[PDB]
Amino acid sequence: PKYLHYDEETSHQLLCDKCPPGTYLKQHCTAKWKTVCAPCPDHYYTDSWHTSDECLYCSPVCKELQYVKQECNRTHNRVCECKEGRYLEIEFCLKHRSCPPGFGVVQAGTPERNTVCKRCPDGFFSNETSSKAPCRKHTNCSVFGLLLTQKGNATHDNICSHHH
Amino acid sequence: PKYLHYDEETSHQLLCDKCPPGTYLKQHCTAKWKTVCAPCPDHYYTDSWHTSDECLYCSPVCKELQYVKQECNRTHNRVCECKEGRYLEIEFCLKHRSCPPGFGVVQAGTPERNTVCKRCPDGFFSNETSSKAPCRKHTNCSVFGLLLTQKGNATHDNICSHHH
Amino acid sequence: PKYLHYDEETSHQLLCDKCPPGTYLKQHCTAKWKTVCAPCPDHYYTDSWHTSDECLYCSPVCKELQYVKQECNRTHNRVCECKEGRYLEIEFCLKHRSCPPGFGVVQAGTPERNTVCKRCPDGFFSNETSSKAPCRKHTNCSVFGLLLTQKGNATHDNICSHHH
Amino acid sequence: AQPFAHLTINATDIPSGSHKVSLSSWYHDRGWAKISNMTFSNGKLIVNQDGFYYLYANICFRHHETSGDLATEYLQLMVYVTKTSIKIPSSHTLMKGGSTKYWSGNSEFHFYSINVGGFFKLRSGEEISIEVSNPSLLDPDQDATYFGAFKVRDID
Amino acid sequence: AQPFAHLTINATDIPSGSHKVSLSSWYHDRGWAKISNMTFSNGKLIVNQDGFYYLYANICFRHHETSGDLATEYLQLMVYVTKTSIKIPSSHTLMKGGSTKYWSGNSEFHFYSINVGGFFKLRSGEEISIEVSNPSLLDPDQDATYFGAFKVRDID
Amino acid sequence: AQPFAHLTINATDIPSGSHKVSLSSWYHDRGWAKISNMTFSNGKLIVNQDGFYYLYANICFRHHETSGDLATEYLQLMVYVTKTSIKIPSSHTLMKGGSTKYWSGNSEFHFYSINVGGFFKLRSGEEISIEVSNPSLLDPDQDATYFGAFKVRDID
Numbered sequence: 024p025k026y027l028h029y030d031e032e033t034s035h036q037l038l039c040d041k042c043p044p045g046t047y048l049k050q051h052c053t054a055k056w057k058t059v060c061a062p063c064p065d066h067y068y069t070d071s072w073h074t075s076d077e078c079l080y081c082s083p084v085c086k087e088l089q090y091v092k093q094e095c096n097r098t099h100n101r102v103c104e105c106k107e108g109r110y111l112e113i114e115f116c117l118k119h120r121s122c123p124p125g126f127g128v129v130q131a132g133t134p135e136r137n138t139v140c141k142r143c144p145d146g147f148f149s150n151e152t153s154s155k156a157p158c159r160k161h162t163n164c165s166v167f168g169l170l171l172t173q174k175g176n177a178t179h180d181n182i183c184s185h186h187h
Numbered sequence: 188p189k190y191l192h193y194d195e196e197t198s199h200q201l202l203c204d205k206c207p208p209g210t211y212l213k214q215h216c217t218a219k220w221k222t223v224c225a226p227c228p229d230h231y232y233t234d235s236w237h238t239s240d241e242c243l244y245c246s247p248v249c250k251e252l253q254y255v256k257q258e259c260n261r262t263h264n265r266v267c268e269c270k271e272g273r274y275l276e277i278e279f280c281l282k283h284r285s286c287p288p289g290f291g292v293v294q295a296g297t298p299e300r301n302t303v304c305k306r307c308p309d310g311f312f313s314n315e316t317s318s319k320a321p322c323r324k325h326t327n328c329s330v331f332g333l334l335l336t337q338k339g340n341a342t343h344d345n346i347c348s349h350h351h
Numbered sequence: 352p353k354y355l356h357y358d359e360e361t362s363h364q365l366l367c368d369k370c371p372p373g374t375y376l377k378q379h380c381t382a383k384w385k386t387v388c389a390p391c392p393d394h395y396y397t398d399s400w401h402t403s404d405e406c407l408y409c410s411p412v413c414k415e416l417q418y419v420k421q422e423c424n425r426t427h428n429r430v431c432e433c434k435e436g437r438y439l440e441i442e443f444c445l446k447h448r449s450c451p452p453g454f455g456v457v458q459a460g461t462p463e464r465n466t467v468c469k470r471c472p473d474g475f476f477s478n479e480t481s482s483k484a485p486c487r488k489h490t491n492c493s494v495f496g497l498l499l500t501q502k503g504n505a506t507h508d509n510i511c512s513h514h515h
Numbered sequence: 516a517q518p519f520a521h522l523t524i525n526a527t528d529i530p531s532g533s534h535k536v537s538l539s540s541w542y543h544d545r546g547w548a549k550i551s552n553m554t555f556s557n558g559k560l561i562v563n564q565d566g567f568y569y570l571y572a573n574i575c576f577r578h579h580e581t582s583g584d585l586a587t588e589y590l591q592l593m594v595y596v597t598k599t600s601i602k603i604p605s606s607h608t609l610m611k612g613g614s615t616k617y618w619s620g621n622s623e624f625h626f627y628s629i630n631v632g633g634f635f636k637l638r639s640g641e642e643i644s645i646e647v648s649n650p651s652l653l654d655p656d657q658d659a660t661y662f663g664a665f666k667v668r669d670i671d
Numbered sequence: 672a673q674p675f676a677h678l679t680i681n682a683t684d685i686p687s688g689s690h691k692v693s694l695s696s697w698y699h700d701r702g703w704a705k706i707s708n709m710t711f712s713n714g715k716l717i718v719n720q721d722g723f724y725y726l727y728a729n730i731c732f733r734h735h736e737t738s739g740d741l742a743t744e745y746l747q748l749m750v751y752v753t754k755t756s757i758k759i760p761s762s763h764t765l766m767k768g769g770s771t772k773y774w775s776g777n778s779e780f781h782f783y784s785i786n787v788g789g790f791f792k793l794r795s796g797e798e799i800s801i802e803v804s805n806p807s808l809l810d811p812d813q814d815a816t817y818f819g820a821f822k823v824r825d826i827d
Numbered sequence: 828a829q830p831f832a833h834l835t836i837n838a839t840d841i842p843s844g845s846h847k848v849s850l851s852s853w854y855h856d857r858g859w860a861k862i863s864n865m866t867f868s869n870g871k872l873i874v875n876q877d878g879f880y881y882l883y884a885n886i887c888f889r890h891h892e893t894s895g896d897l898a899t900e901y902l903q904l905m906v907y908v909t910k911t912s913i914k915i916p917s918s919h920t921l922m923k924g925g926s927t928k929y930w931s932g933n934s935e936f937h938f939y940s941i942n943v944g945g946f947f948k949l950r951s952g953e954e955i956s957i958e959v960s961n962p963s964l965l966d967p968d969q970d971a972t973y974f975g976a977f978k979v980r981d982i983d
């Protein structure tokens with residue numbers, strides 16, 4: 024339904040309605056009396072259906088290099104996130120790790136996690152220092168197209184002209 | 188008078204004397220009973236006439252580059268001040284700002300405030316770095332005395348010999 | 352004896368036994384009742400005979416450059432000491448002072464105290480920087496053995512060949 | 516009848532300043548900010564009831580430079596808890612804390628907290644106030660910058 | 672009927688980690704570690720009895736390098752005291768503290784402590800937890816790393 | 828019948844020393860320095876009445892060199908709160924705090940504070956004492972350097 028719950032007034036145990044996100048609970052249903060649900064106060068909120076008499080304070084404030092992704096509604100808590108390139112590290116928004124001209128991104132940095140780098144396995148490479156770019160595999164000149172001209176290491180692709 | 192105040196014993200409201208600086212109040216006057224004022228204890232004091240039963244503790248201790256201007260009397264609280272050249276900045280006595288060979292003192296540093304510097308307006312100057320010296324105005328050779336020889340900027344006065 | 356002490360039950364004052372190191376006191380003797388002494392719990396201890404109902408917690412944990420000299424028994428508290436060359440300075444185990452190639456150890460550094468250095472008096476010396484070595488006195492070539500060849504300062508012994 | 520307060524910084528209105536500057540801006544009725552039988556007025560926490568109170572304060576300072584250094588790198592970061600009264604206009608410091616600090620350009624971010632606490636005899640009409648140096652560096656978080664009091668004892 | 676707790680770090684089981692990491696390992700019944708009418712369970716201190724509690728925490732960090740430098744020299748050393756509940760799964764921070772720090776190779780040893788305290792309305796079933804950054808640097812001493820609570824007031 | 832103390836440093840008699848040194852010199856009856864149903868004797872705060880006490884301490888260190896550097900620039904600044912007894916001669920540390928610090932010659936002044944607090948079961952005849960490193964750097968202000976205790980609970 025809207026969703027109910029037990030209360031157990033003097034006599035029996037009753038099916039009362041739950042309070043919607045955006046409200047707190049003022050009075051329990053009582054048979055002939057419904058659940059009285061008030062809206063949250065100016066800086067509080069509730070995500071889900073529930074039964075608490077109290078609401079939640081919107082928290083915390085955003086940090087310097089953070090922006091308000093989700094503003095504080097009676098229905099949602101504020102959501103703060105680190106701007107592009109940065110993840111939240113303890114108290115501060117720090118730039119994602121750059122993956123050295125040798126290595127490649129194996130785990131996309133997020134607003135919450137750093138970018139995780141690794142070494143380019145045999146047969147892979149990256150020509151750059153990027154916080155975003157993965158290990159790309161040696162282009163197989165051998166087959167599709169032309170011939171090999173220079174072996175590729177972990178830092179360099181196969182250089183593959185079309186003359187032996 | 189010595190100065191009086193209301194008390195309001197059981198019956199009426201009375202004119203009692205106030206307690207002099209240097210004392211605290213032991214007993215309220217009562218008609219036929221005067222205000223009983225005792226001297227402050229060894230480390231306490233009172234500046235003015237008053238009515239409190241308690242005295243004030245002399246405080247705080249002087250800092251390193253501070254000296255006791257006013258010793259702690261039963262009548263006065265200790266007064267500590269930063270030595271010449273220094274103002275109290277938060278926890279420490281720091282040397283007054285030096286006004287650059289370009290600028291001049293517009294607000295005398297005190298034992299409590301730094302010296303405030305500013306730029307010498309058009310027609311003024313200072314030849315030195317001083318924490319005390321103001322912007323002096325270009326000496327008007329033109330009239331009183333002789334003739335101009337070198338225009339004066341914000342760092343230099345008019346150089347004014349007496350030959351054209 | 353095992354060693355006794357007063358208690359003073361309802362009637363008289365009694366000679367009760369004391370509790371041995373390794374135990375706490377559970378029940379006072381009572382004439383026909385002996386002192387009931389239990390062993391300490393798993394992390395506690397007691398050094399000596401005593402009467403407390405409570406035992407002592409083994410403490411504290413050893414620091415990085417420390418080693419457990421005495422493990423924590425029901426009879427002893429843990430003992431932690433700074434490794435060779437180091438004394439406990441406040442929170443950390445620090446290397447003993449080196450006595451300069453000029454000076455000598457006058458007070459052996461211990462696991463608790465630094466090595467104390469001093470100057471080699473007239474007629475003494477040390478050729479090295481040691482945290483252990485004392486001031487040795489000028490070898491008296493003069494008598495036993497040979498003749499003097501080079502006066503010795505505070506840094507150098509008498510150089511004493513056998514030709515004038 | 517056992518008064519308390521826990522006031523959290525209201526970062527809406529924080530002053531600039533180059534000495535000890537008074538902090539008048541606090542929440543008293545929101546999130547962790549609670550008050551009972553004391554009054555928060557004109558920037559100060561008023562005592563309504565004689566007694567012994569534990570006073571305490573936690574102040575956080577923080578800076579994150581998008582690039583380069585701080586304008587000034589050597590800082591005094593201090594908090595002062597003061598007692599005032601209508602009658603004894605002059606403030607007296609109950610508790611003091613903090614640290615000098617070198618927030619060099621070698622790092623683009625910096626954080627420091629101060630905590631103080633103490634047991635104090637208070638009478639009705641007495642008022643507690645907070646002063647700090649370098650207010651513009653204050654952390655605006657309710658879990659970061661706050662002060663408070665609770666009655667523990669009667670006088671007698 | 673006036674609940675308290677004082678929990679001291681149990682260094683037996685300390686985690687590595689590069690963010691805020693939860694400290695679940697504490698003594699509750701040994702040396703200074705004492706508990707009454709609250710329960711320590713699954714890493715958190717549970718409140719059994721409504722009321723106002725003073726919460727506090729003292730965290731020590733320390734390092735002594737036998738030679739050379741730290742692997743990373745610039746550190747965030749922080750503590751967070753959090754409130755959780757069965758129903759409000761989401762944690763909320765009551766108190767925060769610490770300092771950024773440059774533990775340079777110029778010195779082979781380094782020590783820093785954080786202290787926080789505050790007055791908080793708690794209801795039964797609510798739980799207090801500790802998080803810190805750089806847990807591996809923790810001082811394992813009962814006199815060093817600990818947190819606690821005591822009931823001061825009833826609600827009403 | 829609810830004992831307390833708040834003792835403020837008496838800078839008149841501060842010792843030099845290069846380890847943990849005991850601070851025996853405190854005011855107990857002046858300015859903020861107050862005591863009730865405990866006794867301050869021979870440098871220690873004696874407990875007269877069983878119970879649970881909140882103990883706390885705030886220590887300030889400070890230096891201002893008229894010119895040049897400190898003689899030693901790397902410092903351990905620590906406080907230790909200890910429990911002793913007639914019977915248990917040996918001291919045990921209840922709480923510890925502080926910080927290593929580089930008070931370089933790049934700045935002519937330096938300030939640092941430590942705060943510790945904790946809840947502890949005390950019995951009559953037990954005594955609290957303060958030790959610190961680098962005592963000569965102590966701030967002599969009553970609002971700066973102090974420690975204290977108040978009874979919160981009976982044992983049972």
Ligand SMILES: *[C@@H]1O[C@H](CO)[C@@H](O)[C@H](O)[C@H]1NC(C)=O
Pocket residue numbers: 175176177178179
């Ligand atoms: C990979 O190839 C580049 C270009 O040929 C070369 O400069 C580099 O040294 C190679 N990588 C290694 C470490 O062998």
Ligand SMILES: *[C@@H]1O[C@H](CO)[C@@H](O)[C@H](O)[C@H]1NC(C)=O
Pocket residue numbers: 339340341342343
């Ligand atoms: C002012 O005069 C002096 C001397 O003539 C000169 O050296 C200086 O550059 C002048 N100031 C400026 C900035 O024009």
Ligand SMILES: *[C@@H]1O[C@H](CO)[C@@H](O)[C@H](O)[C@H]1NC(C)=O
Pocket residue numbers: 503504505506507
């Ligand atoms: C002591 O003797 C050595 C070797 O003769 C010499 O080099 C040194 O200068 C002397 N010490 C002093 C300071 O006179």
